[PDB]
Design an enzyme around this catalytic site. Sequence first.
Site, short mmCIF file in Angstrom:
data_model
loop_
_atom_site.label_atom_id
_atom_site.label_comp_id
_atom_site.label_asym_id
_atom_site.label_seq_id
_atom_site.Cartn_x
_atom_site.Cartn_y
_atom_site.Cartn_z
N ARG A 1 -55.67 9.11 -83.19
CA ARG A 1 -55.75 10.44 -82.61
C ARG A 1 -56.39 11.47 -83.54
O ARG A 1 -56.45 12.66 -83.18
CB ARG A 1 -54.36 10.93 -82.18
CG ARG A 1 -53.47 9.85 -81.50
CD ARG A 1 -54.03 9.33 -80.16
NE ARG A 1 -53.45 10.02 -79.01
CZ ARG A 1 -53.81 9.82 -77.74
NH1 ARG A 1 -54.75 8.93 -77.43
NH2 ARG A 1 -53.21 10.49 -76.77
N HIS A 2 -56.89 11.05 -84.70
CA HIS A 2 -57.53 11.97 -85.64
C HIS A 2 -58.79 11.33 -86.21
O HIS A 2 -58.89 10.10 -86.32
CB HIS A 2 -56.55 12.37 -86.75
CG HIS A 2 -55.43 13.23 -86.25
ND1 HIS A 2 -54.17 12.75 -85.99
CD2 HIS A 2 -55.40 14.55 -85.92
CE1 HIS A 2 -53.40 13.73 -85.54
NE2 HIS A 2 -54.13 14.83 -85.49
N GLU B 1 -50.54 17.97 -79.87
CA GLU B 1 -51.09 19.26 -80.27
C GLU B 1 -52.61 19.32 -80.04
O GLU B 1 -53.35 18.43 -80.47
CB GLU B 1 -50.78 19.48 -81.76
CG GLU B 1 -51.34 20.78 -82.33
CD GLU B 1 -51.43 20.73 -83.86
OE1 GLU B 1 -50.57 20.08 -84.49
OE2 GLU B 1 -52.36 21.33 -84.41
N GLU C 1 -58.78 12.88 -94.44
CA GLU C 1 -57.48 12.36 -94.09
C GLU C 1 -57.42 10.97 -94.59
O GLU C 1 -58.32 10.18 -94.25
CB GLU C 1 -57.40 12.18 -92.57
CG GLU C 1 -57.96 13.32 -91.74
CD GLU C 1 -57.02 14.48 -91.77
OE1 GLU C 1 -56.28 14.56 -92.77
OE2 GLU C 1 -57.03 15.30 -90.83
N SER D 1 -53.76 25.13 -82.75
CA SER D 1 -52.84 25.73 -83.70
C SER D 1 -53.33 27.12 -84.08
O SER D 1 -54.54 27.33 -84.23
CB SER D 1 -52.69 24.83 -84.97
OG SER D 1 -51.58 25.23 -85.75
N1 DSZ Z 1 -58.36 15.13 -88.28
C1 DSZ Z 1 -58.43 15.67 -87.06
N2 DSZ Z 1 -59.16 15.05 -86.11
C2 DSZ Z 1 -59.31 15.64 -84.92
N3 DSZ Z 1 -58.84 16.82 -84.50
C3 DSZ Z 1 -58.10 17.41 -85.45
C4 DSZ Z 1 -57.85 16.91 -86.72
N4 DSZ Z 1 -57.06 17.80 -87.44
C5 DSZ Z 1 -56.87 18.80 -86.61
N5 DSZ Z 1 -57.48 18.63 -85.39
C6 DSZ Z 1 -57.48 19.56 -84.27
O1 DSZ Z 1 -57.81 20.86 -84.76
C7 DSZ Z 1 -56.78 21.80 -84.39
C8 DSZ Z 1 -56.68 22.91 -85.42
O2 DSZ Z 1 -56.40 22.31 -86.72
S1 DSZ Z 1 -55.08 22.76 -87.50
O3 DSZ Z 1 -53.93 22.50 -86.70
O4 DSZ Z 1 -55.23 22.15 -88.77
N6 DSZ Z 1 -55.20 24.33 -87.68
C9 DSZ Z 1 -56.20 24.92 -88.39
O5 DSZ Z 1 -57.09 24.29 -88.95
C10 DSZ Z 1 -56.14 26.44 -88.45
N7 DSZ Z 1 -57.25 26.97 -89.28
C11 DSZ Z 1 -56.22 27.03 -87.04
C12 DSZ Z 1 -55.79 28.48 -87.00
O6 DSZ Z 1 -54.73 28.87 -87.43
O7 DSZ Z 1 -56.67 29.25 -86.43
C13 DSZ Z 1 -55.54 20.95 -84.18
O8 DSZ Z 1 -54.60 21.55 -83.29
C14 DSZ Z 1 -56.12 19.67 -83.57
O9 DSZ Z 1 -56.32 19.80 -82.17
MG MG Z 2 -51.73 21.27 -86.69
MG MG Z 3 -48.84 20.02 -85.61
#
Ligand code: DSZ
Ligand code: MG
Ligand code: MG
Lengths: 502, 499
Positions: free
Chosen positions: A275-276, A425, A269, A428
């Site tokens: 938050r990430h 969120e 990223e 997902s």
């Molecule tokens: N950079 C980050 N830092 C911390 N937590 C994070 C993040 N990016 C995402 N998350 C967390 O990881 C979750 C899943 O990531 S995602 O939304 O990109 N979805 C999926 O990846 C699909 N495969 C899932 C599927 O469809 O099974 C998010 O909801 C956040 O809680």
């Molecule tokens: Mg997402």
């Molecule tokens: Mg989202």
Amino acid sequence: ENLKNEATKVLEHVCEDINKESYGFVKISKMKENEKEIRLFNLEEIYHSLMAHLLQSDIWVRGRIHDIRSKGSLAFIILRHKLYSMQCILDIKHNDNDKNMMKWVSNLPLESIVDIKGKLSKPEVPIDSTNIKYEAHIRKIFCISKTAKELPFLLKDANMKETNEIKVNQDNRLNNRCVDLRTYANYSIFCLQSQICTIFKNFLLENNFIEIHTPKLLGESSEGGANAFQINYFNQKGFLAQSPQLYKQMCINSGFDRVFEVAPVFRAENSNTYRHLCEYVSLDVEMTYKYDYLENVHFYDSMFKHIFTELSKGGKNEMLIKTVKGQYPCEDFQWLEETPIFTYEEAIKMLIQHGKLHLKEEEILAYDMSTDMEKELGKIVKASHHTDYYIIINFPSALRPFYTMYKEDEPAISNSYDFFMRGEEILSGSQRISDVNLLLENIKRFNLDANKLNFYIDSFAYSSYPHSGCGIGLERVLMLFLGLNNIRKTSLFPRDPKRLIP
Amino acid sequence: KNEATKVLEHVCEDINKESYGFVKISKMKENEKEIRLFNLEEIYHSLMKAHLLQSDIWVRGRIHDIRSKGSLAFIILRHKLYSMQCILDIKHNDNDKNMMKWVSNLPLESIVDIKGKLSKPEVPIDSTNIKYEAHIRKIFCISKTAKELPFLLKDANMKETSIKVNQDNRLNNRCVDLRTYANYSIFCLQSQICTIFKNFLLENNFIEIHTPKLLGESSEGGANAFQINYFNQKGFLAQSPQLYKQMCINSGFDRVFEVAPVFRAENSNTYRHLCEYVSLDVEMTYKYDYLENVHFYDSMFKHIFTELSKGGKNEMLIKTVKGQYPCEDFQWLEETPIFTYEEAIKMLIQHGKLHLKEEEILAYDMSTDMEKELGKIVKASHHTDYYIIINFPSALRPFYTMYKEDEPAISNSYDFFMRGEEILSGSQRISDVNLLLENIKRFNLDANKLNFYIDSFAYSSYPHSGCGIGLERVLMLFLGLNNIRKTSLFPRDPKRLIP
Ligand SMILES: Nc1ncnc2c1ncn2[C@@H]1O[C@H](COS(=O)(=O)NC(=O)[C@@H](N)CC(=O)O)[C@@H](O)[C@H]1O
Ligand SMILES: [Mg+2]
Ligand SMILES: [Mg+2]
Ligand SMILES: Nc1ncnc2c1ncn2[C@@H]1O[C@H](COS(=O)(=O)NC(=O)[C@@H](N)CC(=O)O)[C@@H](O)[C@H]1O
Ligand SMILES: [Mg+2]
Ligand SMILES: [Mg+2]
């Protein structure tokens, strides 16, 4: 000046027989020389037994010197272990008036580890610092590990609820993480992180899931190559997994039926936000369904209600959470027995109605809800439904990944879902495309290279069960349950675009 | 006479009116009655260890095998490690020959929903562990196999001896390979090992930790570390969580474990090591003797073996693996044998496997082949597949290993073995920052790059020890399998990055 060198000899005294002596630095081997075997207590055992075998005679206890106050013929040591602290008192008059013992004890640096032999008793007015309301009167005290270096900050400051009334800033804490993690709230935070992992896995195992472990070294990015770390893998071009997405589906296509994974993922990223992170622990679930993917959605929902229920119950989780809140106050996480579920369209109309969003009816289908807007929705739902937890479903297919199954009758809409805690969120997921020809069509529609995804695509070519799944951010779940202000508080050694160390 | 192709490709447009055809899942919803859909695991557990016998039931599964003759078609339905024969007899389906043609033409691995009646035949066929049969009233295909399989599952399930499906073929077609009864069972047992490990540690007051795999400096030595460019910083992938699990003990967590991938840029392509694997790591404090923890780690493995070896489900999983890959049951004693490294070498010398003088024993670095020879010796003498070696030579162990202060050539270190091969390695740690700096110098490492780890010892360090365990190796050696690629789902080695 020989007086100063004799004093130095006392301050540095190494004890060579702990049966004859009452203080000094000792090697652990020399406590083997004790005439009796030592039943050594820790402060967790003392807290849980007292808050009879501990009150009868002298006992041995180990701990870190959280605080030491010299007061003439008295010295006061607060010992710390995990969440627990206990006051220990050295009274020179009870130790043959040994002034050198007092000189050696006063000179011990904070965080040093000592073994104390003493007698426990309950005072009239107990220290308010210590959650063990008994005190140890010291008969012997030996230092098995002396602090070697000036502390980067004081734990007294690091533990303070942060007000405008010494703040230790995030950079200082993260840089000296091994000291930062000693605060009561930080200790409790990571105990709770472990609790989330345990509750998650145990719920899934009770529902006939198996745990899987799939590779993080890939030949192709899982969620879009732009934000994938690249690696040289033995003169092949590789990537770190951003998600186990491809492999958890391949496992369902292989017949495993219900799988979960708890493992790191890596995301490059290029935004540095509160938050990430660039590395985090993903909790992933993938499972089949019978006739309606909503079977699985309600299952994921029950899973989270179970997590919340288990996090909120029992003495030890209650104590952990209260300890976090002592430094980082926040209202208790609230959820309902019937989780509110909104379609994306309903959520948009709710925000427009509350004056938080302005869109022409023309603009509604293509609208991509921002994270700030998701927080506004969280506030609205908290006010109307009295909950911090809810679900949005039926996102537009154009805003979801290529593996998301669309509605056959209304293709612009997909069978997808996000879960939210305090308006942010945490999860997902989606019904997956489980027809290899529809999957190839959608891959093409998304302008992706099917040739590079062949190993994944081929896993659908010998039948595919209807299935769905989800991915969950462990650190984000914990952060939002506790209401903490930054995901770096719920990752042990955080990684972000500036921080690779520690 | 092209109506035959329309029969073969028939799509069912009303499941209440029709008895066969390809169907969309949404179409199944149009059934006049709600469908209670069973899987073969439920049927096995209810019948083989009464609702299922008093009515037509619905069952989903994959077509493992199909044969037709005249008016009869036989399908073996498969799910996980369970199979059941289903029989189409079109005398009971209006003598619809078109139904027989459509059914008989279904390709293998297709997923079907069958509405039929269960009954117990006088002579159940031997291959199906469900000893009941389903007589087919209706059968709809919800997912048709699209491509020809790369090899027959009948062949891939066979014990090796003409037919043999080679490892490269299997791993290039891993999502087909994983459908064999043995492979399904192997990865169920892998999950079992993770569960037992974590639950034992949790019951003993450990917490689970998650520490980063992106590092600024390698955890076990740079020669075998993958490099990465991390936002124009130079980093590495973790070969182990060694530095961080010790840092957590220095932070006061007292008892920690991690279950997580590690990455090793292994110089070689061998049968028993991978370039990515799942490490099970433990780190904990001790009171006065690191042997306290060694006995604890020993109890952990005895517990794992005990739980893996129990009756019920795990016994069926193991039996299913052994059906294809036979091997003597894994054996361990009520009291684990512990040898010093010197004792182990002297055992090899006594059996004529090595020729070393006394003054050469500590300088000898025992090879994996010799560890295997020792395993055979100990199996014959002690009647166990599991034992412990302690007190390895200091010079042959990592920089964080504490040596014996009164004989520094020896270290307070230990490896555990299964069938003569290393599954666990660990040690008492150096917990004095000055001794740690000296040992880092002694191993010619760079203290500056290890500064974040070294500094974690500078504000006191508890006496502590730890260990690291190869998950896939434990499973491989428990079952006696010939290759670690059988116990890692999607193996990584110096040539294989795909799948
Ligand atoms: N950079 C980050 N830092 C911390 N937590 C994070 C993040 N990016 C995402 N998350 C967390 O990881 C979750 C899943 O990531 S995602 O939304 O990109 N979805 C999926 O990846 C699909 N495969 C899932 C599927 O469809 O099974 C998010 O909801 C956040 O809680
Ligand atoms: Mg997402
Ligand atoms: Mg989202
Ligand atoms: N390439 C490979 N493939 C598969 N399994 C492997 C492997 N290399 C090692 N293992 C397995 O991982 C275990 C630990 O690895 S290690 O021996 O390098 N030790 C340590 O790392 C210290 N930190 C531990 C400590 O001191 O806590 C080995 O015993 C094997 O079972
Ligand atoms: Mg070895
Ligand atoms: Mg080793």
